[PDB]
Amino acid sequence: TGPMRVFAIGNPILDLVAEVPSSFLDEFFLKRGDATLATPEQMRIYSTLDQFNPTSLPGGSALNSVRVVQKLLRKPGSAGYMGAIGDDPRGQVLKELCDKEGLATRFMVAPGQSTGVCAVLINEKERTLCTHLGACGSFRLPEDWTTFASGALIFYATAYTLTATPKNAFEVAGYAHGIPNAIFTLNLSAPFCVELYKDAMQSLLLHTNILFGNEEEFAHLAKVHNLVTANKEHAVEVCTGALRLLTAGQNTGATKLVVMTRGHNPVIAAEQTADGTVVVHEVGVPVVAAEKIVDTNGAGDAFVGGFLYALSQGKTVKQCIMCGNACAQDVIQHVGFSLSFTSLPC
Numbered sequence: 001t002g003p004m005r006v007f008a009i010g011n012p013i014l015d016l017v018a019e020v021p022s023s024f025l026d027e028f029f030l031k032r033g034d035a036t037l038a039t040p041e042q043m044r045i046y047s048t049l050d051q052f053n054p055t056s057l058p059g060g061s062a063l064n065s066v067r068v069v070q071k072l073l074r075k076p077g078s079a080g081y082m083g084a085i086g087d088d089p090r091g092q093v094l095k096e097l098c099d100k101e102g103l104a105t106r107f108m109v110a111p112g113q114s115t116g117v118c119a120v121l122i123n124e125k126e127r128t129l130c131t132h133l134g135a136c137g138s139f140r141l142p143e144d145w146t147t148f149a150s151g152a153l154i155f156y157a158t159a160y161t162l163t164a165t166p167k168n169a170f171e172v173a174g175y176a177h178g179i180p181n182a183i184f185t186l187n188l189s190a191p192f193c194v195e196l197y198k199d200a201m202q203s204l205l206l207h208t209n210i211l212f213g214n215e216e217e218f219a220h221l222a223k224v225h226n227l228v229t230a231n232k233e234h235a236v237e238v239c240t241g242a243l244r245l246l247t248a249g250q251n252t253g254a255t256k257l258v259v260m261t262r263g264h265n266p267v268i269a270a271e272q273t274a275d276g277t278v279v280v281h282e283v284g285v286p287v288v289a290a291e292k293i294v295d296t297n298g299a300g301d302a303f304v305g306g307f308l309y310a311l312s313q314g315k316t317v318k319q320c321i322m323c324g325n326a327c328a329q330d331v332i333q334h335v336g337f338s339l340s341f342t343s344l345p346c
């Protein structure tokens with residue numbers, strides 16, 4: 001077991017994948033192609049779906065990312081994860097699935113609440129998602145979480161964790177800050193996380209070494225924080241401005257990097273070396289035949305997972321981005337977030 005190289009916090013979700021007739025979508029008032037949170041009546045969808053013998057997969061942004069890390073590091077217990085689940089059957093199913101993959105996990109159990117679950121409904125070549133977050137929102141790091149984190153030097157949190165409470169991400173980042181060789185990495189996760197948690201992020205970013213995000217996320221960050229994307233010069237301007245939220249214009253000599261994925265366009269990143277100078281990185285994204293692209297859901301999670309894996313191996317920024325691109329490219333060729341040990345990238 002171990003050593004654990006990467007530790008992450010997130011909202012754990014059990015994904016249930018199955019092909020269903022259109023009548024199923026209509027019965028639960030679902031619009032094909034949309035992704036939503038379950039309404040009261042839609043709550044009955046989960047036990048109903050269990051009867052379809054769905055493929056059960058661990059899910060949730062951060063959990064998907066560490067599963068990629070765990071996959072690439074190979075050795076059992078190479079990546080750790082903490083989050084909240086319920087004391088229901090789904091909670092045990094999720095834990096067992098994670099155990100099967102060799103991921104080290106410590107789930108806080110919230111008695112009487114349901115484990116996060118997402119119905120991944122396949123119909124007419126489209127995926128319709130209906131998620132019930134449940135226990136995820138009650139997560140609070142245990143007082144001895146650092147013991148679980150062992151000698152990990154790479155910490156990751158998604159902005160989605162701010163929903164339960166910004167205190168979890170703040171505590172993880174604070175712990176990482178006290179360790180010279182450790183880094184804290186954050187995902188912007190969604191434009192609304194950027195909007196809702198403006199104040200919290202202001203403080204958190206000053207304790208962040210690597211910031212991940214896509215175009216829309218960075219665009220809102222630039223507006224919210226008045227920092228200033230299909231256009232390069234503009235993307236660079238945004239990244240350069242965002243880097244200031246991490247450095248405050250000072251040079252601690254610690255890792256300071258902002259990485260912006262831009263769909264098909266090249267990844268753009270702005271870095272401040274221990275030297276104190278700013279550097280702009282640009283890495284093109286290898287395309288795959290349109291005929292292979294099956295499910296784009298999880299591409300971003302895979303990118304971060306691959307980047308973190310490469311980072312744990314001491315690769316250059318560009319190599320980390322290249323590994324992330326390769327992982328994203330690999331996962332979109334099948335529905336649901338999963339990877340096989342054969343022909344792994346990076």
Ligand SMILES: Nc1ncnc2c1ncn2[C@@H]1O[C@H](CO)[C@@H](O)[C@H]1O
Pocket residue numbers: 010011012013015059060061062064118129131160297298301
């Ligand atoms: N707020 C969230 N926190 C954690 N996992 C999430 C969240 N929203 C969606 N997910 C999961 O992550 C997948 C997308 O990366 C979704 O299909 C779902 O299973």
Ligand SMILES: [Cl-]
Pocket residue numbers: 009010011012060061062063158160161
């Ligand atoms: Cl998450």
Ligand SMILES: [Mg+2]
Pocket residue numbers: 176177178179180181182183184
């Ligand atoms: Mg540190």
